[PDB]
Write an enzyme that holds these catalytic residues in place. Structure first.
Site, PDB file in Angstrom:
ATOM      1  N   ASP A 131      -7.140  -3.886   4.034  1.00  0.00           N
ATOM      2  CA  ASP A 131      -6.277  -4.989   3.611  1.00  0.00           C
ATOM      3  C   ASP A 131      -6.161  -5.215   2.104  1.00  0.00           C
ATOM      4  O   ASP A 131      -5.477  -6.148   1.654  1.00  0.00           O
ATOM      5  CB  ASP A 131      -6.743  -6.279   4.261  1.00  0.00           C
ATOM      6  CG  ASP A 131      -5.603  -7.156   4.642  1.00  0.00           C
ATOM      7  OD1 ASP A 131      -5.403  -8.205   3.971  1.00  0.00           O
ATOM      8  OD2 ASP A 131      -4.888  -6.760   5.603  1.00  0.00           O
TER       9      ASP A 131
ATOM     10  N   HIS B 227     -11.864   2.312   8.377  1.00  0.00           N
ATOM     11  CA  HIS B 227     -13.108   2.813   7.807  1.00  0.00           C
ATOM     12  C   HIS B 227     -13.630   4.073   8.502  1.00  0.00           C
ATOM     13  O   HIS B 227     -14.056   5.016   7.834  1.00  0.00           O
ATOM     14  CB  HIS B 227     -14.197   1.745   7.830  1.00  0.00           C
ATOM     15  CG  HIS B 227     -15.475   2.205   7.207  1.00  0.00           C
ATOM     16  ND1 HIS B 227     -16.604   2.508   7.944  1.00  0.00           N
ATOM     17  CD2 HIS B 227     -15.790   2.459   5.915  1.00  0.00           C
ATOM     18  CE1 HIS B 227     -17.563   2.910   7.127  1.00  0.00           C
ATOM     19  NE2 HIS B 227     -17.095   2.889   5.890  1.00  0.00           N
TER      20      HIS B 227
ATOM     21  N   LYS C 290      -4.250  -0.326   0.212  1.00  0.00           N
ATOM     22  CA  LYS C 290      -4.240   1.130   0.099  1.00  0.00           C
ATOM     23  C   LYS C 290      -2.915   1.765   0.558  1.00  0.00           C
ATOM     24  O   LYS C 290      -2.350   2.618  -0.126  1.00  0.00           O
ATOM     25  CB  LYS C 290      -5.392   1.716   0.891  1.00  0.00           C
ATOM     26  CG  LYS C 290      -6.748   1.576   0.195  1.00  0.00           C
ATOM     27  CD  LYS C 290      -7.869   1.832   1.151  1.00  0.00           C
ATOM     28  CE  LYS C 290      -7.996   0.636   2.077  1.00  0.00           C
ATOM     29  NZ  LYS C 290      -8.039   1.043   3.450  1.00  0.00           N
ATOM     30  N   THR C 291      -2.424   1.358   1.716  1.00  0.00           N
ATOM     31  CA  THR C 291      -1.210   1.965   2.269  1.00  0.00           C
ATOM     32  C   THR C 291       0.026   1.570   1.450  1.00  0.00           C
ATOM     33  O   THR C 291       0.944   2.374   1.246  1.00  0.00           O
ATOM     34  CB  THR C 291      -1.082   1.568   3.726  1.00  0.00           C
ATOM     35  OG1 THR C 291      -2.111   2.251   4.456  1.00  0.00           O
ATOM     36  CG2 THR C 291       0.313   1.905   4.319  1.00  0.00           C
TER      37      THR C 291
HETATM   38  N1  LIG Z   1       0.431 -10.354  -2.582  1.00  0.00           N
HETATM   39  C1  LIG Z   1       0.216  -9.032  -2.469  1.00  0.00           C
HETATM   40  N2  LIG Z   1      -0.046  -8.533  -1.259  1.00  0.00           N
HETATM   41  C2  LIG Z   1      -0.263  -7.214  -1.097  1.00  0.00           C
HETATM   42  C3  LIG Z   1      -0.226  -6.330  -2.267  1.00  0.00           C
HETATM   43  N3  LIG Z   1      -0.465  -5.085  -1.810  1.00  0.00           N
HETATM   44  C4  LIG Z   1      -0.655  -5.163  -0.474  1.00  0.00           C
HETATM   45  N4  LIG Z   1      -0.527  -6.444  -0.059  1.00  0.00           N
HETATM   46  C5  LIG Z   1      -0.611  -6.907   1.331  1.00  0.00           C
HETATM   47  O1  LIG Z   1      -1.871  -6.690   1.936  1.00  0.00           O
HETATM   48  C6  LIG Z   1      -1.681  -6.458   3.325  1.00  0.00           C
HETATM   49  C7  LIG Z   1      -2.413  -5.181   3.667  1.00  0.00           C
HETATM   50  O2  LIG Z   1      -1.971  -4.169   2.759  1.00  0.00           O
HETATM   51  P1  LIG Z   1      -2.161  -2.622   3.153  1.00  0.00           P
HETATM   52  O3  LIG Z   1      -1.460  -1.820   2.097  1.00  0.00           O
HETATM   53  O4  LIG Z   1      -1.788  -2.208   4.553  1.00  0.00           O
HETATM   54  O5  LIG Z   1      -3.778  -2.571   3.060  1.00  0.00           O
HETATM   55  P2  LIG Z   1      -4.709  -1.355   3.530  1.00  0.00           P
HETATM   56  O6  LIG Z   1      -5.462  -1.714   4.794  1.00  0.00           O
HETATM   57  O7  LIG Z   1      -5.651  -1.269   2.346  1.00  0.00           O
HETATM   58  O8  LIG Z   1      -4.020  -0.041   3.763  1.00  0.00           O
HETATM   59  C8  LIG Z   1      -0.192  -6.291   3.570  1.00  0.00           C
HETATM   60  O9  LIG Z   1       0.356  -7.467   4.174  1.00  0.00           O
HETATM   61  C9  LIG Z   1       0.353  -6.067   2.182  1.00  0.00           C
HETATM   62  O10 LIG Z   1       1.736  -6.428   2.052  1.00  0.00           O
HETATM   63  C10 LIG Z   1       0.052  -6.961  -3.561  1.00  0.00           C
HETATM   64  O11 LIG Z   1       0.125  -6.314  -4.614  1.00  0.00           O
HETATM   65  N5  LIG Z   1       0.251  -8.278  -3.580  1.00  0.00           N
HETATM   66 MG   LIG Z   2      -3.752   1.173   5.286  1.00  0.00          MG
END
Ligand SMILES: Nc1nc2c(ncn2[C@@H]2O[C@H](COP(=O)(O)OP(=O)(O)O)[C@@H](O)[C@H]2O)c(=O)[nH]1
Ligand SMILES: [Mg+2]
Length: 373
Positions: A14, A61, A17-18
């Protein structure tokens, strides 16, 4: 015809990363280029002005553990994503640890979700926590490039206060300069794991295999390493499908003609190498992933003194496992560091991967973390 570099995103669920993976393809498009064991990976590609990047991203993870230990490609660099809004979290720590274990040479940080932080002190706090984390696992925390921004703004083509597009651009340029050109297999010291051995009527020896790296040429001096005391030898020819040649290259299946080798100075599982290039070892630290019941491994939890077969390149060797202080057992699907002592010597370096088997039944995947002896 651009240099190929393997990267990926790591960090806690969250944290972005994606999203950062998607922003990277979009930003490089706009400012440069275009566009058994079960493992969920996403793969993507983007170019800077000077490099072609192949980029891996995993959902959860468990995927990172399996991929980093036994994944299709070894990262030349990893992008640690940490949420500036939340600070570091358990998998922020564990993914740095795992990068150390697995031999990832460089880590760059993107402090994400800057759009959510209007507080210089909090950014400073989180940056210091992360530098410290890196240094805890021997990465150069004080000198690590840390880029602060919003992956989500970048993904949406936004760049207010240079938090978005510009920040992801700065990240790519950091990739360009902080991660050196990796050395290709063809340019590393010669190594071929030996498979079969055939005496040429007592006048020389063919040892067969697939050249793992480098080049071998007629007249080259070579060592034979592992299982028994190192011996020296000389290449007098290379046998390929249909042909006797003077050379063989990484990737190629061949018989290397040798002179100066005694019938049983040479056997399967030793490595033919450039002299002084790799040494034999018996004892090491390793990160191991123990297969899942479902993955065809074990349903039983094993204990201290476990003696499985370790498969290194073309042979296996029995080894004793020592768990870490504070652990008595290891369940299927776990990943742990353990100290291993082999019965016989075997050629090895930090970062070498190996399989663990019980009676030809794969139960683990591991990488050598640190050679002891
Ligand atoms: N406010 C904000 N939210 C973000 C940002 N980057 C990611 N998110 C939010 O964090 C949530 C999870 O992001 P995701 O890229 O899937 O995280 P992952 O599990 O690390 O792959 C999503 O709802 C994204 O839109 C950012 O720069 N700003
Ligand atoms: Mg992801």
């Amino acid at each position: 015809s651009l240099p190929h570099v393997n990267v990926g995103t790591i960090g806690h669920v969250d944290h972005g990363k994606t999203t950062l993976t998607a922003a990277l393809t979009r930003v490089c498009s706009e400012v440069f280029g275009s566009a058994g064991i079960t493992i969920n990976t996403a793969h993507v590609e983007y170019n800077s002005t000077i490099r072609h990047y192949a980029h891996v991203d995993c959902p959860g993870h468990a995927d990172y553990v399996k991929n980093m230990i036994t994944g299709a490609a070894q990262m030349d660099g990893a992008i640690l994503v940490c949420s500036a809004a939340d600070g570091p979290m358990p998998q922020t720590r564990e993914h740095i640890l795992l990068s150390r274990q697995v031999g990832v040479p460089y880590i760059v940080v993107f402090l994400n979700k800057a759009d959510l932080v209007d507080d210089a002190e909090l950014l400073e706090l989180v940056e210091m926590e992360v530098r410290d984390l890196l240094s805890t696992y021997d990465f150069p925390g004080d000198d690590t490039p840390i880029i602060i921004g919003s992956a989500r703004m970048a993904l949406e083509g936004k760049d207010d206060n240079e938090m978005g597009t510009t920040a992801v651009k700065k990240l790519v340029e950091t990739l360009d300069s902080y991660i050196p050109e990796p050395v290709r297999a063809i340019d590393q010291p010669f190594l071929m794991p030996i498979e079969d051995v055939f005496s040429i009527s007592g006048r020389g020896t063919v040892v067969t295999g697939r050249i793992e790296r480098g080049i071998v040429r007629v007249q080259d001096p070579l060592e034979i390493v592992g299982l028994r005391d190192t011996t020296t030898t000389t290449c007098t020819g290379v046998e390929m499908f249909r042909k006797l040649l003077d050379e063989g290259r990484a990737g190629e299946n061949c018989g290397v003609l040798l002179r100066g080798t005694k019938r049983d100075d040479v056997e399967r599982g030793q490595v033919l190498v450039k002299p002084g290039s790799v040494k034999p070892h018996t004892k090491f630290t390793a990160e191991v992933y123990v297969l899942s019941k479902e993955e065809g491994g074990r349903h039983t939890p094993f204990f201290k003194g476990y003696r499985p077969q370790f498969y290194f390149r073309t042979t296996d060797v029995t080894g004793n496992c020592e768990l870490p202080e504070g652990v008595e057992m290891v369940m299927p699907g776990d990943n742990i560091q353990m100290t291993v002592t082999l019965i016989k010597t075997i050629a090895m370096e930090d970062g070498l991967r190996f399989a663990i088997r019980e009676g030809g039944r794969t139960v683990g995947a591991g990488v050598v973390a640190k050679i002891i002896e």
